[PDB]
Design an enzyme around this catalytic site. Structure first.
Site, PDB file in Angstrom:
ATOM      1  N   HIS A 109       0.606   4.212  -2.675  1.00  0.00           N
ATOM      2  CA  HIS A 109       0.231   5.585  -2.328  1.00  0.00           C
ATOM      3  C   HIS A 109       1.353   6.597  -2.590  1.00  0.00           C
ATOM      4  O   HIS A 109       1.042   7.754  -2.895  1.00  0.00           O
ATOM      5  CB  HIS A 109      -0.230   5.754  -0.872  1.00  0.00           C
ATOM      6  N   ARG A 153       0.840  -1.219   0.000  1.00  0.00           N
ATOM      7  CA  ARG A 153       0.000   0.000   0.000  1.00  0.00           C
ATOM      8  C   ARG A 153       0.877   1.273   0.000  1.00  0.00           C
ATOM      9  O   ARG A 153       0.563   2.205  -0.660  1.00  0.00           O
ATOM     10  CB  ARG A 153      -1.033   0.040   1.139  1.00  0.00           C
ATOM     11  N   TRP A 196     -10.386  -8.829   2.527  1.00  0.00           N
ATOM     12  CA  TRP A 196     -11.038  -9.141   1.263  1.00  0.00           C
ATOM     13  C   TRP A 196     -11.058 -10.654   1.048  1.00  0.00           C
ATOM     14  O   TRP A 196     -11.731 -11.184   0.170  1.00  0.00           O
ATOM     15  CB  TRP A 196     -10.314  -8.508   0.080  1.00  0.00           C
TER      16      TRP A 196
HETATM   17  C1  HEM Z   1      -9.859   2.556  -6.550  1.00  0.00           C
HETATM   18  C2  HEM Z   1      -8.661   2.327  -6.094  1.00  0.00           C
HETATM   19  C3  HEM Z   1      -8.399   1.955  -4.641  1.00  0.00           C
HETATM   20  C4  HEM Z   1      -9.091   2.282  -3.557  1.00  0.00           C
HETATM   21  C5  HEM Z   1     -10.335   3.132  -3.415  1.00  0.00           C
HETATM   22  C6  HEM Z   1      -8.460   1.720  -2.415  1.00  0.00           C
HETATM   23  C7  HEM Z   1      -8.887   1.823  -1.129  1.00  0.00           C
HETATM   24  C8  HEM Z   1      -8.306   1.190  -0.045  1.00  0.00           C
HETATM   25  C9  HEM Z   1      -8.739   1.245   1.319  1.00  0.00           C
HETATM   26  C10 HEM Z   1      -9.937   2.089   1.765  1.00  0.00           C
HETATM   27  C11 HEM Z   1      -7.934   0.494   2.059  1.00  0.00           C
HETATM   28  C12 HEM Z   1      -7.959   0.212   3.562  1.00  0.00           C
HETATM   29  C13 HEM Z   1      -6.955   1.061   4.303  1.00  0.00           C
HETATM   30  C14 HEM Z   1      -7.051   0.807   5.774  1.00  0.00           C
HETATM   31  O1  HEM Z   1      -8.143   0.965   6.285  1.00  0.00           O
HETATM   32  O2  HEM Z   1      -6.045   0.456   6.349  1.00  0.00           O
HETATM   33  C15 HEM Z   1      -6.945  -0.090   1.200  1.00  0.00           C
HETATM   34  C16 HEM Z   1      -5.991  -0.960   1.579  1.00  0.00           C
HETATM   35  C17 HEM Z   1      -5.069  -1.529   0.768  1.00  0.00           C
HETATM   36  N1  HEM Z   1      -4.803  -1.211  -0.514  1.00  0.00           N
HETATM   37 FE1  HEM Z   1      -6.227  -0.316  -1.778  1.00  0.00          FE
HETATM   38  N2  HEM Z   1      -7.414   1.034  -2.908  1.00  0.00           N
HETATM   39  C18 HEM Z   1      -7.289   1.121  -4.233  1.00  0.00           C
HETATM   40  C19 HEM Z   1      -6.339   0.592  -5.025  1.00  0.00           C
HETATM   41  C20 HEM Z   1      -5.241  -0.085  -4.647  1.00  0.00           C
HETATM   42  C21 HEM Z   1      -4.096  -0.430  -5.472  1.00  0.00           C
HETATM   43  C22 HEM Z   1      -3.930  -0.041  -6.951  1.00  0.00           C
HETATM   44  C23 HEM Z   1      -3.226  -1.107  -4.705  1.00  0.00           C
HETATM   45  C24 HEM Z   1      -1.835  -1.681  -5.039  1.00  0.00           C
HETATM   46  C25 HEM Z   1      -1.552  -2.094  -6.213  1.00  0.00           C
HETATM   47  C26 HEM Z   1      -3.797  -1.213  -3.402  1.00  0.00           C
HETATM   48  C27 HEM Z   1      -3.271  -1.855  -2.335  1.00  0.00           C
HETATM   49  C28 HEM Z   1      -3.817  -1.947  -1.091  1.00  0.00           C
HETATM   50  C29 HEM Z   1      -3.317  -2.850  -0.061  1.00  0.00           C
HETATM   51  C30 HEM Z   1      -2.212  -3.895  -0.148  1.00  0.00           C
HETATM   52  C31 HEM Z   1      -4.141  -2.576   1.158  1.00  0.00           C
HETATM   53  C32 HEM Z   1      -4.026  -3.277   2.513  1.00  0.00           C
HETATM   54  C33 HEM Z   1      -3.159  -2.480   3.464  1.00  0.00           C
HETATM   55  C34 HEM Z   1      -3.144  -3.079   4.851  1.00  0.00           C
HETATM   56  O3  HEM Z   1      -3.646  -4.165   5.057  1.00  0.00           O
HETATM   57  O4  HEM Z   1      -2.602  -2.404   5.707  1.00  0.00           O
HETATM   58  N3  HEM Z   1      -4.960  -0.570  -3.429  1.00  0.00           N
HETATM   59  N4  HEM Z   1      -7.249   0.347  -0.016  1.00  0.00           N
END
Ligand code: HEM
Length: 293
Positions: free
Chosen positions: A51, A47, A190
């Site tokens: 970001h 993440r 997920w």
């Molecule tokens: C429409 C695009 C995306 C949206 C709206 C989105 C939104 C989010 C949200 C809301 C979270 C949870 C954060 C938290 O509460 O800790 C998250 C986690 C995460 N995102 Fe996405 N995301 C998007 C795309 C992506 C992309 C392109 C990647 C990497 C290629 C990615 C990788 C991750 C990963 C690995 C987590 C888990 C982090 C953790 O467990 O601490 N995301 N995302």
């Protein structure tokens, strides 16, 4: 009008130097396994890599991975980035041991290392990101909202020069980790294998029975009886007929997903960067397992 950011190799360094940095990250991933109820730091480092790269704007080449600007408080304190401080803290001892690597190179290498160590595809990675000053930090608000629909998602990613296939492939990273209510207003994983990189995200989208519910922050999310969730933007990938075909492809072809993810992820990490024609070729790091370490 666009800035030009030319990659410049950290002086005198070569593949061996970065494999050492890789290895230190990978060993710490192994060591600090208790993080986030034993999910480990893999997902948050992925993440963080996304970001720090995803602020890019193709129109003027602002933001992007090159400048390493997450180290500055405006970007560090973006509400969109809540939770990523954990990734940054993980990388601090790494940066202390290898102070010659740029911040951008470190944040992006953290994401590559995490994917590979979690048994994901190899991701070729190029060095030479250069730290840029505090006033080059992009403003808050360039990262995407989760409550929107497929048209939002498509339009959003145009700004990062990603097409439908690239978008669906990148979203498969949501196999990893979980949403955390206090960070983002969403809660839950997920899927089940959330520190092993697989195509589970697509299988779950298609095969779970999803219900639209409100979580404890009063936000809507899709929930399954297995205890999994999907963001509105995730679910939008099966609501849109063009995205849905691609979801089905990746749900039915692990290798294809791995190849497409690898390409899209490298591209995301390299957006905004000009590589001189004489730059080194992309590096493909060996995992700890491949090294017998
Ligand atoms: C429409 C695009 C995306 C949206 C709206 C989105 C939104 C989010 C949200 C809301 C979270 C949870 C954060 C938290 O509460 O800790 C998250 C986690 C995460 N995102 Fe996405 N995301 C998007 C795309 C992506 C992309 C392109 C990647 C990497 C290629 C990615 C990788 C991750 C990963 C690995 C987590 C888990 C982090 C953790 O467990 O601490 N995301 N995302």
């Amino acid at each position: 009008k666009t800035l030009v950011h030319v990659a410049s190799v950290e002086k005198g360094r070569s593949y061996e130097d970065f494999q050492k940095v890789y290895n230190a990250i990978a060993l710490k991933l192994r060591e600090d396994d208790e993080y986030d109820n034993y999910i480990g730091y893999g997902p948050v480092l992925v993440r963080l890599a996304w970001h720090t790269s995803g602020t890019w704007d193709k129109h003027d080449n602002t933001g992007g991975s090159y400048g390493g600007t997450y180290r500055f408080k405006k970007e560090f304190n973006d509400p969109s980035n809540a939770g990523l401080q954990n990734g940054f803290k993980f990388l601090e001892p790494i940066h202390k041991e290898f102070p010659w690597i740029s911040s951008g190179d470190l944040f992006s290498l953290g994401g590559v290392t995490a994917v590979q160590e979690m048994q994901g595809p190899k991701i070729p990675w190029r060095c030479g990101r250069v730290d840029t000053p505090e006033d080059t930090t992009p403003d808050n608000g360039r990262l995407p909202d989760a409550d929107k629909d497929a048209d939002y998602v498509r339009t959003f990613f145009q700004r990062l020069n990603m097409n439908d296939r690239e978008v669906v492939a990148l979203m498969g990273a949501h196999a990893l980790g979980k949403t955390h209510l206090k960070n983002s207003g969403y809660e839950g994983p997920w899927g089940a294998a959330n520190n092993v990189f697989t195509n589970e995200f697509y299988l779950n989208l298609l095969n779970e029975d999803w219900k639209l519910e409100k979580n404890d922050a009063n936000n809507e999310q899709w929930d399954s009886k297995s205890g999994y969730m999907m963001l509105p933007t995730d679910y939008s990938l099966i609501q849109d007929p063009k995205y849905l075909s691609i979801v089905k492809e990746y749900a039915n072809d692990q290798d294809k997903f791995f190849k497409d993810f690898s390409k899209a992820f490298e591209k995301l990490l390299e957006n905004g960067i000009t590589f001189p024609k004489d730059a080194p070729s992309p590096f493909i790091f060996k995992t700890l397992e491949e090294q017998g370490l």
